Amino acid sequence: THLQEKNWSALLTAVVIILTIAGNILVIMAVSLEKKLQNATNYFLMSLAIADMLLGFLVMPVSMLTILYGYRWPLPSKLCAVWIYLDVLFSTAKIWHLCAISLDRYVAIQNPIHHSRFNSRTKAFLKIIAVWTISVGISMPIPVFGLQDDSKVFKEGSCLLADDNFVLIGSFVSFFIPLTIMVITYFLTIKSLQKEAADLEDNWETLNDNLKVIEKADNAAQVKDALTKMRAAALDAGSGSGDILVGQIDDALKLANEGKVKEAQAAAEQLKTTINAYIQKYGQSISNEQKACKVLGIVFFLFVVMWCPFFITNIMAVICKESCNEDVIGALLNVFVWIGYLSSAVNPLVYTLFNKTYRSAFSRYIQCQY
């Protein structure tokens, strides 16, 4: 039966709604409770999850109500523009949250002391508020012109963004520009991390060369010279983390400055083991940045690929009003809108897959074990 089609569409819509709300609430709880997940990127991801939850709680159920009424808007006229504004607001906020994550992490890894433990919570919160304000500013044209003009938000009785200029400018400002920025920033990030690993290997090379020089030293002058080169290398290798290693090298360097050559050589001998350990630690930190980069790239790819069919079909239907068939186009737009909405529910599953802390948190939350 063809009414069974409406029943199935509404049912699958409800499935997507419940999945979105539940998963993003799980992400909210994970970021709100775990102190192991309290850096800037996780604050951005929790803001992202609340945005997706607001989308799945205020916008997607109204879309289900719309698809139940034969796509005829049953609510008051102003609520159509309000609902389109909220929809565009939350989706634009999501994509620009992703863009801000990419850019912020890139700018961070640019800073030569970005491995220090001192990160400010308030700065990340201010960035999140700035992104939400950007989203509100991008979405304001719909309330401005939509409440003034009933025709720009209504399309044959149906509550759709009918202005072609609005559609194209919103596709560019809200989807295409942040997508391109995301791609560029991601590839620049992989290049910067490669540079980081290369510099770390160079620091290790310097450390080994000067340890070997110290092992065969004769007088205090060359001991101090090799220890100075070692101190520079070790300070560079920490990427601002801040450890005992440079302090131990300074202890050996004091021994060298006093003229004690044998004791300085013994100190360098202990430093050899300490240096191997710390170098491996720094390499592991770089590898962790690489893994986080790839996971966030998976997130970006899933979101963009799931929203791409809708934007493709929408811009195409704006271009060809009669060249292309519009019944199949309307069916495609329905299906692709709901795929893009499914993108909002996909994220917590991805957090579960490639993150052990998120997965443990969710496994303990399903059983209510806090």
Ligand X SMILES: Cc1nc2n(c(=O)c1CCN1CCC(c3noc4cc(F)ccc34)CC1)CCCC2
Ligand Y SMILES: CC(C)CCC[C@@H](C)[C@H]1CC[C@H]2[C@@H]3CC=C4C[C@@H](O)CC[C@]4(C)[C@H]3CC[C@]12C
* Interface ranges with Zn ion (CB under 5 A): 289
HEC readout, 48-90: HHHHHHHHHHHHHHHHHHHHHCCCCCCCCHHHHHHHHHHHHHH
Applying CB under 6 A, does 140 fall inside the site for ligand Y?
Answer: no
Q: Which residues contact 113 (CB under 8 A, 6 or more apart)?
A: 239, 240
Cβ proximity to ligand Y: between 27 and 337 the closer is 27
Q: Cα separation of 306 and 284, whole Å?
A: 33
* Nearest Cα residue to 312 out of 275, 339, 292: 339
Count of positions on this chain that bind ligand X (CB under 6 A)? 15
Applying CB under 6 A, does 47 fall inside the site for ligand Y?
Answer: yes
| Count of residues in the chain | 370
Q: Cα separation of 23 and 324, whole Å?
A: 38
Cβ proximity to ligand X: between 87 and 289 the closer is 87
CA dihedral 329, 331, 332, 338 (to 10 degrees): 140
Return the structure tokens found at 25: 């609430």
Applying CB under 6 A, does 289 fall inside the site for ligand X?
Answer: no
- The minimum distance between CB 247 and ligand X, in angstroms, equals 48
User: Whose CB is nearest to ligand X?
Assistant: 95
Cβ proximity to ligand Y: between 51 and 333 the closer is 51
Return the structure tokens found at 314: 């929408």
Applying CB under 6 A, does 41 fall inside the site for ligand X?
Answer: no
- The minimum distance between CB 47 and ligand Y, in angstroms, equals 4
- Residue from 333, 345, 347, 351 binding ligand X (CB under 6 A): 333
The site partner of 88 among ligand Y, ligand X, Zn ion, none (C-beta below 5 to 8 Å per kind) is ligand X
Task: Write out the residues near ligand X by the rule CB under 6 A.
Answer: 63, 87-88, 91-92, 95, 160, 174-175, 307, 330, 333-334, 337, 340
Task: Write out the residues near ligand Y by the rule CB under 6 A.
Answer: 43, 46-47, 50, 125, 128-129, 132, 136
